[PDB]
């Protein structure tokens, strides 16, 4: 029927068909679809239709000190469309509009699908804080509120565990053996192997693998990890399914192949390529502490998330678990001290979680919550108390952590989890969260066979509750990016390689962009407030980068938009943009951290969205150019950069503002990059705006600690009065990140596992970079040594890349 045409629209939006059962050996996925219906409807029938349509973007956080100093009269001016209006920072939208008349009209931002509404001071609106920080005037049009009817939704034993290894099969390709692990949170409970047989296209064993664990000692979420060594292939089977039933019967599991640790290795999904992939065939038929110990316990609790716990430490934590329960910071280490392979201990663990008044009353610590949601915890009861703390996150904070909460779904043992349901709720409650939730989920569905099925089921559940209006937006957005990505590919084939630009390329590009325009208006995926109209064909070009990316520019479809600037987007194939997304988001989290301490390092975390395999889109920051390109124009010469700034800034005052913007923006990327270990970059990959705002680009796949070349130093003048500022802002910013050391360490390690090509040694860099277990005095001295290395080295590393 027509209801089945609705499901075909969902499939096109998703990029995957969730009704397909071609790759399932149980009904867990469908069971989850049905299970997600409840949380969907509960959030739909509970959200306010009015605020849902206007979707006010608001924060409950305080107004930073560096923004108060920009309003030195306690008078915020709002230009309504037109007379300017004197307003107090604590003036509510209603008190402003009623003061405007002296009835149901609403204030909407010019050139944006954004609204300033609700019981909140204008001081607490994100669009207002943006205008203030960037010294812009708040322009708004008195418009009629969007029809809430547009958001309407289409209503809907003591025996040891045994495994029978029959054999492996592959029509492709030493000696191989089968290793079967019983795993829980990457903790190998017991391990058994087969005998090494000749590696042929068919290898049968017909052997029972005896494990040391009993059947009723198997914890929920425990994985049967089956691996082949010559390690070339792996595959997993949940031993207890979504119905708490011990898994039994025959299985033919198509395994994933290894390339020559990370989240993919954990998935319960089987390889969908049954034609080429290796197969496996199996059979299942079944007082209080003394002073000295308390100090040792507290010392253990105080260490970082990456500090390994010894057997003694674990035994200590467990025996004094009720003492450890009083410290929320002890929870990650405590639950790592649990013998999950023992039913009795798991029981005591649950009774311990029964009364958790301290944990329930503690202030929300995201860094501590994330640690409970990573690969080290499979127990759903432990993970639930994590998602519990997330519930107190305001929408502004959900957006901060959305990308890596979505990635964290990869660490969930089952498809239907508290973490999934949480994202679903918060996505249906806020259109901005829902919008980015769509693109984050869709990003993984398109280039991850390991998790596309789970993410698809989740995306379908969101799409059925977001409302008919947003379904229309997503469809337009999807249709446009599909057209543009086609043009991106065809143009890449024509240029080939070793040719900067051809006459025939500029011809075909402007030809296809003309043909393609005959998609009236689409929402900008990386900036959902902005809508894009007709292409500015004359501005469109191929940038002549290594991959020949498209430089496209559009017109804003909003006539109320004051300016006439175009919306720029770069389409690129060849780079894995999922890595740039993760880095950029961490940059935003660093900005957020710095805001807590009234800092502003002027980072420019541009918009970036992965849409497919090595393909996606990148926001174009206006009036920006490469620092290396600035050297090629006049020429190695260090005087150049300051010369370029004077040229672009007409007034002498605007120039000093650029140098102020520079010393700030410079310091921000110095600290951020070193902490993340991406500071040693080529001059080409660093850009600057005409207003002196420095920023890095292209974070995919990445000797000096970072980049502070003499050309940058010349802009500072060198010791100088503003270099003293630079050395000052860095230590302030650096020591500020160390105050959130645990949060940064967990996000970093998660970024490596869920988005990078990843062993223990890789993560430990950020720990050293953050000077773990060091005094603030010594740490400040550490970072300054790093600054001096950029001085002593000069262009030594800079010149090297030229080969
Ligand atoms: N993974 C990637 C890929 C790209 C690339 F566009 F494909 F090259 C970029 C990037 C962004 C950018 N930005 C992003 C911020 O807004 C301005 C454009 N400018 C450039 N340039 C290459 C250049 C060399 O001179 C061509 Cl004109 C400038 N490159 C970043 N990350």
Residue numbers in the entry: 145 to 225, 230 to 250, 268 to 321, 357 to 373, 379 to 435, 460 to 489, 497 to 522, 545 to 776, ...
Article, verbatim:
Phosphoinositide 3-kinases (PI3Ks) promote cell growth, survival, division and motility, and signal through protein kinase B (PKB/Akt) and the mammalian target of rapamycin (mTOR) to control cellular growth and proliferation. BKM120 is a potent PI3K inhibitor, but has been reported to also act as a microtubule-destabilizing agent (MDA). We succeeded in separating the activities of BKM120 as a PI3K inhibitor and an MDA by minimal chemical modification of its core pyrimidine ring.
A 3.2 Å resolution crystal structure of the PI3Kγ catalytic subunit (p110γ) in complex with BKM120 has been previously reported. At this resolution a precise positioning of the BKM120 molecule in the p110γ-binding site is not possible. To validate the rotational orientation of BKM120 in PI3K, the asymmetrically substituted BKM120 derivatives PIKiN1 and PIKiN2, as well as their relevant regioisomers PIKiN1-R1 and PIKiN2-R1, were produced. Interestingly, PIKiN1 and PIKiN2 bound to recombinant p110γ, p110α, p110β and p110δ with a 7–30-fold higher affinity as compared to their regioisomers, which was also confirmed in a p110α activity assay measuring directly PtdIns(3,4,5)P3. To clearly determine the orientation of the substituted morpholino group, a bulky chloromethyl-azetidin-methanol substitution was introduced: here the orientation of the pyrimidine core of PIKiN2 bound to p110γ could be unambiguously determined in a crystal structure resolved to 2.51 Å. Its core pyrimidine C–H group points towards Tyr867 (position U in Fig. 5e and Supplementary Table 8). Closer inspection of the p110γ–PI3KiN2 and p110γ–PI3KiN3 complex structures revealed that (i) the core nitrogen in position V is hydrogen bonded through a structured water molecule to Asn951 and Asp964, and (ii) that the trifluoromethyl-pyridin-2-amine group and aspartates 841, 836, 964 coordinate two additional structured water molecules (best resolved in the PI3KiN3 complex). Molecular dynamics simulations with BKM120 docked into p110γ demonstrated that positioning of the pyrimidine core C–H group towards Tyr867 kept the structured water network intact (CU–H). In contrast, when BKM120 was oriented as in the initially reported structure by Burger and colleagues (CV–H), hydrogen bond interactions between the inhibitor, water molecules, side chains of Asp964 and Asp836 were disrupted.
